[PDB]
């Protein structure tokens, strides 16, 4: 069956939100995550209190970086986000290096991966995707898998208002999951969370969650809205 769902907020007034969250009742087992920017990290660190919520940093690579975050008491990290890869020019190899560094340092990690409008049109989604992951996996250990979460988000669906169809997410999630099953393990694979990210809103969410291989979400825009709750609520 499904592993624990995950609803993660990617924070690209906030306190009015944490207030909401904080006063919200989450009945089921789901792990909530609010990734924030270094600036709001302290805010969020104090204000956020819902026992079902954690905070995660963003592309905080470095040895010392890692250490302080931890020390600061930050245990989750978002790595390989399109922003990173695009504006910062991080390569799969680079992404992987960071992921492996996070993991060795105890972080829980959300490694992001996903294909462009172009790569998609050309029908190169599996190549691309398998490739991204095979870069990370190569640096991991079967054991390390216990700390990694994969976020699948088609670049063209990020903030464009263009969600994948439940079939596209499913299909992709499925291949991700199959490659892991085969290459890593079946046991690694079946315990693995593969989130969908890319234009998720409290409206489309349920339909997305329902797919066999979707384990949650990674939400930018609607995670700045009160509907983030409707979002978390769908992971049930």
Which of 90, 115, 153, 173 is catalytic? The answer is 153
User: Phi/psi of residue 234, each to 5°?
Assistant: -75, -20
Technique employed here was X-ray
Is 81 in the active site?
yes
Contact 34, 12 (CB under 8 A): no
164 CB-near residues (< 8 Å, 6+ apart)? 154, 157, 172, 196, 198, 199, 208
Determine if residue 169 is left, alpha or beta; phi over 0 gives left, psi from -120 to 50 gives alpha, anything else beta.
alpha
Catalogue the long-range contacts made by 12-16 (C-beta closer than 8 Å, 24 or more residues apart).
Answer: 12/37, 12/83, 12/220, 14/40, 14/43, 14/44, 14/224, 15/43, 15/47
**The two three-digit tokens of residue 139, written as one number:** 């640096």
d(CA 114, CA 120): 10
Cβ within 8 Å of residue 121, ≥6 positions away: none
CA-CA distance, 202 to 230, in Å (whole number)?
A: 5
Which residues participate in the annotated binding site?
10, 12
Q: Residues annotated as binding site for substrate?
A: 10, 12
Nearest to 198 by CA among 162, 226, 223: 162
CATH value at residue 6: 3.20.20.70
* Structural resolution in Å: 2.4
Domain ranges, residue 143: 1-236
Catalytic site residue from 46, 81, 93, 173: 81
For residues 199 and 164, give the distance between their C-alpha atoms in angstroms, rounded to a whole number: 8
Measured CA to CA, the distance from residue 23 to residue 210 in angstroms comes to: 27
- Report the C-alpha gap between 21 and 153 in whole angstroms: 24
Write the CA distances from 221 to 30, 39, 62, 190, 194, integer angstroms.
20, 18, 28, 30, 20
For the chain, what is the domain count? 1
93 is catalytic: no
């Amino acid at each position: 069956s499904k592993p624990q769902p995950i609803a993660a907020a990617n924070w690209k007034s906030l306190s009015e939100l944490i207030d909401l969250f904080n006063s919200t009742s989450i009945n089921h087992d789901v792990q909530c995550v609010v990734a924030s920017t270094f600036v709001h990290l302290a805010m969020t660190k104090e204000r956020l209190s819902h026992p079902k919520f954690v905070i995660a940093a963003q592309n905080a690579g470095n040895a010392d970086g890692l250490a302080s975050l931890k020390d600061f008491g930050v245990n989750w990290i978002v790595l390989g986000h399109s922003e990173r890869r695009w504006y910062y020019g991080e390569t799969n190899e680079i992404v992987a290096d960071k992921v492996a560094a996070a993991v060795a340092s105890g972080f829980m990690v959300i490694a992001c991966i996903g294909e462009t409008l172009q790569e998609r049109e050309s029908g190169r989604t599996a190549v691309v995707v398998l490739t991204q992951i095979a870069a990370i996996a190569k640096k991991l250990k079967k054991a390390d898998w216990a700390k990694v979460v994969i976020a699948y988000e088609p670049v063209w669906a990020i903030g464009t208002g263009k969600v994948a169809t439940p079939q596209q997410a499913q299909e992709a999630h499925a291949l991700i999951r199959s490659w892991v099953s085969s290459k890593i393990g079946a046991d690694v694979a079946g315990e693995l969370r593969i989130l969908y990210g890319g234009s998720v809103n409290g409206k489309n969410a349920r339909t997305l969650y329902q797919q066999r291989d979707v384990n949650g979400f990674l939400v930018g825009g609607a995670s700045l809205k009160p509907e983030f709750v409707d979002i978390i609520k769908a992971t049930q």
